């Protein structure tokens, strides 16, 4: 029997947070992910990790579809994989953030899906959907992004005449432009340029680049 998400791994009998194999496509091929079985009861599947700044997240539309990085350190699970999970089960979002002043923050969203109930994710541009927002330390930036297709310097889907993905040095479900750019350039602290680093607008504004970043997912 195969665990397709990481809440299954909780049921399999594994509760130590680490790298694990889950089968979102099928029993043919797994894909490794890191799971945070500790935070708020555990069962978190992580589709986004950043901390060293070593891995560059200014990648193309193809890398963000298939995913890139190491499940150990910084990585991105991949938009296709994420859509496979959100397509077959209802999921909850949690993002956990940290600055360079030894402070932590987070934000939770009850519903989370990538292009939900879409017969083809490509055609729909892998839209992001987030519903009811429960506040943690940080504010609510993602509710601004709900309903927006994922954009890169390869594929501009944003509502802006310019290429907001190119101006922001990252990839996100951009609108006129982001309130959250968790794939921006790791400028490591404050920066005089506008809205191009790993920024959570509602927590540390547009001129502050976080130190650590990770976006977690759990079953409904």
């Amino acid at each position: 029997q195969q665990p397709l998400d990481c809440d299954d791994i909780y049921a399999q009998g594994y509760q130590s947070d680490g790298v694990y194999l889950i089968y979102p496509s099928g029993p043919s091929v797994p894909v490794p992910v890191f799971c945070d079985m500790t935070t708020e009861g555990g069962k978190w599947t992580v589709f986004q990790k950043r901390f060293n700044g070593s891995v560059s997240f200014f990648r193309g539309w193809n890398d963000y579809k298939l995913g890139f990085g190491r499940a150990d350190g910084e990585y991105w699970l991949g938009l296709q994989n994420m859509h496979l999970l959100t397509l077959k089960q209802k999921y909850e979002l949690r993002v956990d953030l940290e600055d360079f002043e030894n402070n932590t923050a987070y934000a939770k969203y009850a519903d989370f899906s990538i292009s939900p109930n879409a017969v083809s994710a490509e055609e729909d541009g892998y839209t992001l959907f987030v519903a009811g927002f429960e506040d943690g330390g940080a504010g609510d930036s993602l509710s601004y992004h709900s309903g927006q297709k994922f954009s890169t310097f390869d594929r501009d889907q944003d509502l802006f005449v310019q290429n907001c993905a190119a101006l922001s040095s990252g990839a996100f479900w951009f609108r006129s432009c982001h309130f959250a750019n968790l794939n921006g350039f790791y400028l490591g602290g404050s920066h005089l340029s506008y809205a191009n680093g790993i920024n959570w607008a509602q927590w540390k504004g547009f001129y502050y680049s976080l130190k650590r970043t990770e976006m977690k997912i759990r079953r409904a």
């Epitope: 399999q12 909850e92 079953r219």
Partner: antibody
Framework: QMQLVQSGPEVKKPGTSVKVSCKAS????????MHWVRQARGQRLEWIGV????????KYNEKFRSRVTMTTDTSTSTAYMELRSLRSDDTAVYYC???????????????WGQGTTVTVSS | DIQMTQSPSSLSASVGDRVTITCRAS??????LAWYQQKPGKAPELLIY???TLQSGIPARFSGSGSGTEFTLTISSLQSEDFAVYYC?????????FGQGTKLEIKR
């Protein structure tokens, strides 16, 4: 129906070991985590630890490590709890409880046995 | 680590009354807490979980609220079955602490 049948009482001398059984019926035993809790009379309940039958992974309370060891027999749908070196204050009622799953924090016990009153005295 | 202290140690009230029990946390415990109802010489039964959500089959008059350090359990109108000992559990962290226990007795 969903039931957990624990072992009857045992009287043990100090320093000896006791082995408590807890057999499951009415639900697939391998699916749910199993918790062990003790209730000293008129005092605060103490959570012993947890074990999953399918994997056998365990997680204990810090003060009971080295003393308690948990095992499970998958064939008979039984969960075991054994406290190795006993102490006069360990006299209490020992329960086995099932953690339901519920799309989130879970970690709360919806189905309980019915007690194994353990008495330790010289 | 993460002591739980219940109040009042004993409460006496009559049928039909509104009753409230409180569980206190030593450190911030977040949204997650659960309550139990233990009859004499019986196994505990679970009532509320994650602070405010009740288990299936529990009467609607049971309801929980609170967050952070203070939590409360209230019953709209008591009934003869409601008189028992109520325990509050830690639930958020994995040391796992329990509440001191609150006796709810009938008043004559």
């Amino acid at each position: 129906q969903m039931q957990l049948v624990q072992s009857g009482p045992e009287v043990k001398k100090p320093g000896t070991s006791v082995k408590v059984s807890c057999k499951a019926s009415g639900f697939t035993f391998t699916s749910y985590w199993m918790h062990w809790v003790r209730q000293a009379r008129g005092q605060r309940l103490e959570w012993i630890g947890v074990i999953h039958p399918n994997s056998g992974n365990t997680k204990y309370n810090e003060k009971f490590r080295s003393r308690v060891t948990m095992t499970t027999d998958t064939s008979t749908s039984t969960a075991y709890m054994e406290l190795r070196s006993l102490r006069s204050d360990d006299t209490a009622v020992y329960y086995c409880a099932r953690e339901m799953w519920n799309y989130g924090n879970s970690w709360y016990f919806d189905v309980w046995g019915q007690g194994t009153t353990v008495t330790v005295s010289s | 680590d993460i002591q739980m202290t219940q109040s009042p140690s004993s409460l006496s009230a009559s049928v039909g009354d509104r009753v409230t029990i409180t569980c206190r946390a030593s450190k911030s415990i977040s949204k997650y807490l659960a309550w139990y109802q233990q009859k004499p010489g019986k196994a505990p039964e679970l009532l509320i979980y994650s602070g405010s959500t009740l288990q299936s089959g529990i009467p609607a008059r049971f309801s929980g609220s609170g967050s952070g350090t203070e939590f409360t359990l209230t019953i709209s109108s008591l009934q003869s079955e409601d008189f028992a000992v109520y325990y509050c559990q830690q639930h958020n962290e994995y040391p796992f602490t329990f509440g001191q226990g609150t006796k709810l007795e009938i008043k004559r």
